[PDB]
Design a binder for this molecule. Structure first.
Ligand SMILES: c1cnc2c(c1)ccc1cccnc12
Ligand SMILES: [Ca+2]
Ligand SMILES: [O]
Ligand SMILES: [V+3]
Length: 223
């Protein structure tokens, strides 16, 4: 997260770190047994880390639970990043309390202009590299479909939305992938892609979670 702020420990209690020996992506806890992340975050050997603030120190609220199964969306296209969503089933159920809690799926899509909370442990620089140990946060508005399409002509599908600031300075970045975009208490986005980070006229692009609730529910119903 470039241009954000330190969230404060366990104030984003649905935020997960995906670990394969190291943090490589975020995700969102949607119930005691399932995490939503980006399909482009797929890898084998994932451990889900819940209750994290500093990802390099055991602070006392963590739950570390291995994935038993990962399910990339059937129509995920890694070339276009269309349908950039994946479900991760936990080997054992998370214990839900104030420091670890699920985030609700949407019933309806979010509106443009809605201020959302984006979070993660990604790069905090738009040029150069600096990775934070504690969870970073960013408040960012959903942008119009037309502004999004103007920013990335020929690249935005109906399963994507832009959020952020056309002036630059504030964005998600490398290592935030797969993490939440929460608007009015619903998981509306997943950190997907952009063109650099925090550049003028290049806002972040997010998977539009409201288009996947049927697939999520059906999948959870049978796995
Ligand atoms: C870890 C983190 N981010 C990424 C990947 C792995 C792989 C692909 C990709 C494409 C767009 C944005 N982020 C990532
Ligand atoms: Ca920790
Ligand atoms: O990334
Ligand atoms: V990334």
């Amino acid at each position: 997260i470039v241009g954000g702020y330190t969230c404060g420990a366990n104030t984003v209690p649905y935020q997960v770190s995906l670990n394969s020996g190291y943090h490589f992506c975020g995700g969102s806890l949607i119930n005691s047994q399932w995490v939503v992340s980006a399909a482009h975050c797929y890898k084998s050997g994932i451990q889900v880390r819940l209750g994290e603030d500093n990802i390099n120190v055991v602070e006392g609220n963590e739950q570390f639970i291995s994935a038993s199964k990962s399910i990339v969306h059937p129509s995920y296209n890694s070339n276009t990043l269309n349908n950039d969503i994946m479900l991760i089933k936990l080997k054992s159920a998370a214990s839900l309390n104030s420091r670890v809690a699920s985030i609700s799926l949407p019933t309806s899509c979010a509106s443009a202009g809605t201020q959302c909370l984006i979070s993660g442990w990604g790069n905090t620089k738009s040029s150069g590299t600096s990775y934070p140990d504690v969870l970073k946060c960013l408040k960012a508005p959903i942008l119009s479909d037309s502004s999004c399409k103007s920013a990335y002509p020929g690249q935005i599908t109906s399963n994507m939305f832009c959020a952020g600031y056309l002036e630059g300075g504030k964005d998600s970045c490398q290592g935030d992938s797969g993490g939440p975009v929460v608007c009015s208490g619903k998981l509306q986005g997943i950190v997907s892609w952009g063109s650099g980070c925090a550049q003028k006229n290049k806002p972040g692009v997010y998977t539009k979670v409201c288009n996947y609730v049927s697939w999520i529910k059906q999948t959870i119903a049978s796995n």
